[PDB]
Design a protein around this ligand. Structure first.
Ligand SMILES: CCCCCCCCS[C@@H]1O[C@H](CO)[C@@H](O)[C@H](O)[C@H]1O
Ligand code: NA
Ligand code: NA
Lengths: 212, 498, 215
């Protein structure tokens, strides 16, 4: 059960510092390296550097050293990376991964879900959830005026996953906007209940029903 | 920074370093003098508690430093221990292999010269003296042993010209670098070396005279007395032999390992190289010298031959023995060609540390590093060539006392100052097999304990004699090698400044 | 640095056909008999997945449809036969020397039969109107090819001011695409016009699909 878990949804103001974590388990933490990856929205992967927790030694890509700092606590089978003097260009997703040491196969066979770091001066804002009833039938759920990412738009409390299209949020004027459609049989609605669940970690969660 | 091209090349190069004249000359003499077959008990223990662990450590320290672009101890010691004093202690890692190379490449050239002589049939031709004499006189005329009171050696022109050829051969290999030079040569020399050894072992085994058979000598080197074990001198002799045979404490292994990729195996690779050397020593090495000697002189005298010294055995006794058997001339050529490859693969290993420093720290090109090293060696060797007992003086301070002290030094820095846990995880990383957990305690407590005892014993037993009994000429060498340490200390200084 | 150049950047293949990506290294990535080239698959929203290691070695758990080959500086990823779930971006990665480097990545599109968008228009919520803001949503779901455009029309007049769009990546199931357009306005400006219409231009029809209401 090799697993790498990372902290998530870190927000920080320009110039400040942030420290991502990577809790590992299911394997001998000391026999492997842990390296970090930077991926900006809609772009490729960048190697930041790696560390061998068993000895403590670290390696950086010349581009990232000074910006990133790799550490690791051998005891808690955990590895950390601090990003300093944050910029708008530091806003991206960061992956930690386990790199195998056996040869000849130096590769990353296990990854963490990744951490989305956002660097902005915008202030936290709760989302406004709006039901979208029609004028198969298609229903929708609009979530506007929130910050920062992410939110959690589920429909019937997890159930009813088919026919759903949750679109990626879009930033505009320092406020995100999200939407999601759900296509069901005409005989199913409004005959049956269909509720929209929207969760915002930074603020609060709302739940509204598609009536009419 | 260059790396070893292949796993095999690495092992054959490392093994090439360990394999030396000691495998064929020093071991048979030591084994015969220290209990014969009984000598194997302390020998194997020393191989386990001191030999292997220290080898893995040097391998690891080398690979560790290499990953940061350092192949010499002045830098590596400083990495493991951020302290001004660490860089000075590291200077020994340059001083030892340098001083040793100053007299070893010359000793090496001898074997080549003899090989050239035996090949051309220019070798000399009743009692044990009228047979040995022509060869003693041959050797002494070669290296120029003084027939007078003066402490001056008078090497033959042939001897001198061969040293230049030997220096040239060394440069030719080193100047091509690691993979295309040392490694490429290692892949050729090592198989060649084992073929000559095996061939000789077979040919020698077929020797028989009314005085004895080759099988007799084999049934003496391996017949255990099991009474010498009580004598603590044998344990000290065994630990010494093991330490010398694996070429530990020279800083040569560290330099070689610094060309190993950061997480490429060193546990199994190191174990393999060590095994190759032990096979070439106890099996091949301990089956040529003594057995052949015993074959003619007899079971009787066996002690005398061993006692007569490891040097007289290889350069006087055997050649004379060969010149007695049929076709022994070509047989003697194979003996010295074997000893020449044995030395050639090691001289390049002890000259590399200096080369590495110049490249890594002073940023010299390989060509300039090799040639400047070659110059320092060639020049310095003149002190060994013309000054009597100079070779002996260097061999003691650097090749005897120095190596052991440095061995204990690098072990304490890596496993104590640097961190026992960190050091352990460093050694095992990338290992095809993991180092037996028991070795964690051995390396930390046992190994350093043995080395400390070996130093305390060798010191209390050797230094007072060297300081008082020796001729005054001894200072001209001490002065010069002290200057060499000061010279290297200055280079390290300039390196940190740049 | 060893730069890796993948090709093509984009690729479209049918459900039975073979997909071939290539990775060209600036210098050899081989060492002592092994080729340190690796291949990863990344679906949108999740981390990369190890498909091939050592250039030709199939990672445990990965379907035999994926195969690796090549050495030195030339490598190719092979997917055959291609399946709907193979829709993702693929990266080649070298582990020969620091620093580790990835290829540009190749987005693999799974070709399906054409399909018109299921357009739906939604009037501003009653809760939103009272809030002071009014916006109209228009979903265009499950269509292919991916190329499509929308035009907002208020009283027959084009409207580009205050429009937000958002696409989803190709579905792992039916290999289609979906889009969400959102025209936002002020309350009093919304209740100052007759009707609202969102037009959808797509390969499937010469005439753009139209959906509208009259508040
Ligand atoms: C620093 C460079 C010095 C060059 C030579 C150093 C001195 C000794 S040479 C001397 O020539 C002699 C007569 O022929 C014999 O000993 C041999 O022939 C040859 O040794
Ligand atoms: Na040896
Ligand atoms: Na040798």
């Amino acid at each position: 059960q090799v697993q790498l878990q990372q902290s998530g949804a870190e927000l920080a103001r320009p110039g400040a510092s942030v420290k991502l974590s990577c809790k590992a388990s299911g394997y001998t933490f000391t026999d492997y390296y842990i390296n970090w990856m930077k991926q900006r929205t809609g772009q490729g992967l960048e190697w930041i550097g790696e560390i061998y927790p068993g000895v403590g030694t670290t390696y950086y890509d010349e581009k990232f050293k000074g910006k990133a700092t790799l550490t690791a606590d051998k005891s808690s089978r955990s590895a950390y990376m601090q990003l300093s003097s944050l910029t708008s260009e530091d806003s991206a997703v960061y992956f930690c991964a386990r790199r195998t040491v056996t040869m000849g196969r130096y590769a990353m066979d296990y990854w963490g879900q990744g951490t989305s770091v956002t660097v902005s001066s915008a202030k936290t804002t709760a989302p406004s959830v709006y039901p979208l009833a029609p004028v198969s039938v298609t229903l929708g759920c609009l979530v506007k005026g929130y910050f920062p990412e992410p939110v959690t738009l589920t429909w019937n409390s997890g159930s009813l996953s088919s026919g759903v299209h949750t679109f990626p949020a879009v930033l505009q004027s320092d406020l995100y906007t999200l939407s999601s459609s759900v296509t069901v049989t005409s005989s199913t609605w409004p005959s049956q209940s269909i509720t929209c669940n929207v969760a915002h970690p930074a603020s609060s969660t709302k739940v509204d029903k598609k009536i009419e | 920074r260059e790396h070893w091209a292949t796993r095999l090349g690495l092992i054959l190069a490392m093994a090439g370093n360990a394999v030396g004249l000691g495998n064929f000359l020093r071991f048979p003499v030591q084994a015969a003098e220290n209990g014969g077959g009984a000598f194997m008990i302390p020998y194997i223990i020393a191989f386990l508690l001191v030999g292997i662990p220290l080898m893995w450590i040097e391998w690891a320290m080398g690979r560790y430093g290499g990953a940061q672009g350092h192949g010499t101890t002045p830098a590596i010691f400083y990495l493991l221990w951020r302290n001004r004093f660490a860089k000075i202690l590291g200077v020994f890692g340059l001083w030892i292999p340098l001083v040793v190379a100053i007299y070893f490449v010359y000793i090496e050239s001898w074997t080549l010269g003899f090989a050239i002589k035996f090949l051309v049939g220019l070798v000399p031709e009743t009692d044990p003296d009228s047979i040995l004499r022509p060869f003693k006189e041959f050797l002494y005329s070669y290296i120029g042993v003084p027939k007078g009171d003066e402490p001056i050696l008078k090497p033959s022109l042939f001897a001198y010209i061969v040293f230049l050829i030997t220096m040239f051969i060394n440069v030719s290999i080193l100047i091509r670098g690691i993979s295309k030079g040392i490694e490429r040569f290692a892949k050729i020399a090592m198989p060649t070396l084992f073929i000559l050894a095996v061939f000789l072992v077979i040919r020698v085994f077929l020797l028989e005279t009314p005085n004895g058979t080759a099988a007799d000598g084999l049934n003496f080197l391996w017949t255990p007395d099991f009474e010498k074990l009580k004598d603590p001198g044998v344990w000290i002799a065994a630990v010494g032999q093991i330490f010398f045979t694996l070429s530990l404490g020279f800083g040569a292994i560290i330099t070689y390992a610094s060309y190993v990729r950061k997480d490429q195996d060193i546990v199994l690779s190191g174990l393999t190289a060590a095994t190759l050397n032990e096979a070439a020593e106890v099996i091949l090495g301990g089956s040529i010298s003594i057995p052949a000697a015993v074959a003619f002189f007899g079971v009787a005298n066996a002690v005398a031959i061993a006692k007569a010294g490891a040097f007289n055995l290889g350069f006087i006794t055997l050649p004379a023995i060969f010149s007695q058997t049929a076709g022994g001339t070509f047989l003697g050529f194979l003996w010295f060609f074997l000893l020449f490859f044995a030395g050639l693969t090691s001289s390049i290993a002890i000259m590399q540390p200096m080369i590495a420093f110049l490249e890594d720290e002073l940023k010299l090109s390989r060509k300039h590093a090799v040639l400047w090293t070659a110059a320092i060696v060639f020049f310095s060797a003149h002190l060994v060539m013309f000054l009597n007992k100079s070779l002996d003086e260097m061999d003691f301070w650097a090749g005897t006392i120095g190596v052991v002290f440095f061995g204990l030094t690098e072990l304490i820095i890596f496993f104590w100052i640097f961190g026992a846990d960190k050091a352990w995880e460093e050694i095992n990383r990338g290992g095809i097999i993991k180092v037996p957990r028991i070795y964690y305690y051995v390396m930390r407590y046992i190994t350093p304990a043995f080395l400390a005892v070996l130093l305390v014993v060798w010191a209390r037993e050797y230094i007072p004699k060297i300081m008082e009994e020796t001729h005054w000429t001894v200072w001209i060498t001490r002065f010069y090698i002290i200057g060499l340490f000061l010279f290297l200390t200055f280079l390290v200084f300039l390196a940190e400044r740049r | 640095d060893i730069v890796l150049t993948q090709s093509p950047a984009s690729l479209a293949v049918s459900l039975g056909q073979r997909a071939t990506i290539s990775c060209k290294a600036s210098q050899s990535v081989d060492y002592d008999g092994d080729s340190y080239m690796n291949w990863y698959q990344q679906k949108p929203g999740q981390p990369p997945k190890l498909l091939i290691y050592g250039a030709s070695n199939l990672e445990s758990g990965i379907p035999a449809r994926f195969s690796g080959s090549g050495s030195g500086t030339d490598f190719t990823l092979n997917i055959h036969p291609v399946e709907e779930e193979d829709a993702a971006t693929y990266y080649c990665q070298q582990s020969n020397e620091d620093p580790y480097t990835f290829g540009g990545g190749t987005k693999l599109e799974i070709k399906r039969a054409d399909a018109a968008p299921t357009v739906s228009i939604f009037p501003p919520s009653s809760e939103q109107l009272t809030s002071g803001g009014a916006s109209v949503v228009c979903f265009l779901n499950n269509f292919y090819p991916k190329d499509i455009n929308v035009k907002w029309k208020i009283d027959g007049s084009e409207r580009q001011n205050g429009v937000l769009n958002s696409w989803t990546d190709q579905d792992s199931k039916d290999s289609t695409y979906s889009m969400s357009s959102t025209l936002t306005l002020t309350k009093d400006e919304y209740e100052r016009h007759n009707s609202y219409t969102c037009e959808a231009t797509h390969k499937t029809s010469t005439s753009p699909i139209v959906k509208s209401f009259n508040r």
